[PDB]
Amino acid sequence: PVFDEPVYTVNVLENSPINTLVIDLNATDPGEVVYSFINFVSNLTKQMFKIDPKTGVITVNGVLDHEELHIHEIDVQAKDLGPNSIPAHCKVIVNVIDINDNAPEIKLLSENSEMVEVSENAPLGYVIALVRVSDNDSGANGKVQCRLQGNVPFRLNEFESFSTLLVDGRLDREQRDMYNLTILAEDSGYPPLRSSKSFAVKVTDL
Ligand SMILES: [Ca+2]
Ligand SMILES: [Ca+2]
Ligand SMILES: [Ca+2]
Ligand SMILES: [Ca+2]
Structure with a gap:
């Protein structure tokens, strides 16, 4: 797999409702590939976002507070269920927009x-x-x-x-x-x- 872009940047309102779309990632096309986070610059970033392992859709998962943290860096990979198979990586930067x-x-x-x-x-x-x-x-x-x-x-x-x-x-x-x-x-x-x-x-x- 190969992510369409190496780095993605998305704006998201603070206090966005749970399940708000953040981004739908893509590292294949027409699937057996598995999308996951492998790193989370802040450990807070880990409660704030979930990703669907099958579609690569990231959604809001906890309460996003600009006054707590402005900007989130997430590292995402894609790996086929594979005996030998290297991962694709991208970075997703989430700007939390102050209200x-x-x-x-x-x-x-x-x-x-x-x-x-x-x-x-x-x-x-x-x-x-x-x-x-x-x-x-x-x-x-x-x-x-x-x-x-x-x-x-x-x-x-x-x-x-x-x-x-x-x-x-x-x-x-x-x-x-x-x-x-x-x-x-x-x-x-x-x-x-x-x-x-x-x-x-x-x-x-x-
Ligand atoms: Ca997708
Ligand atoms: Ca706030
Ligand atoms: Ca605010
Ligand atoms: Ca104010």
Whole structure:
């Protein structure tokens, strides 16, 4: 036998259903030849794909997760039931294509994820905390954007790779003691997924 091509590359959606076709291989024609995997660069690759020993059809066999692994290399052979008979080999590269299956995570940089205080004497601009928003997806699906909600005497400041929670108002512990702030976040995949974190700011005099 001889595979039509030496190397094949196929795209497959992440989260593809079990039994999704990946590729139908061919190393003969008009059969007694036996298609099999002989190697699996990652050992994870072994649960993700099955192949029909008779037709050489590879199908999805477990849950394909882009965030777990992007790209699979499989080595396939074809061998006739034969007393003496050499195998044909090919490589099958499976690109697992990322979809937006991950909402944005919103992280506060403080020593606690709500316990977060300030002094009313802090001026216009005092960075009280740092927020980091992440998304495990790639590309647009993973580009995130966020925004403080309600209106309140703070504001977020937009940097590449992080945001800073400032004061934007005269504070005094007497007029307003606690606050409840909400951060809303949205990624740029389709459909856009979105996430939000509500967290407390307690004010002090010192
Ligand atoms: Ca075939
Ligand atoms: Ca995933
Ligand atoms: Ca994804
Ligand atoms: Ca996402």
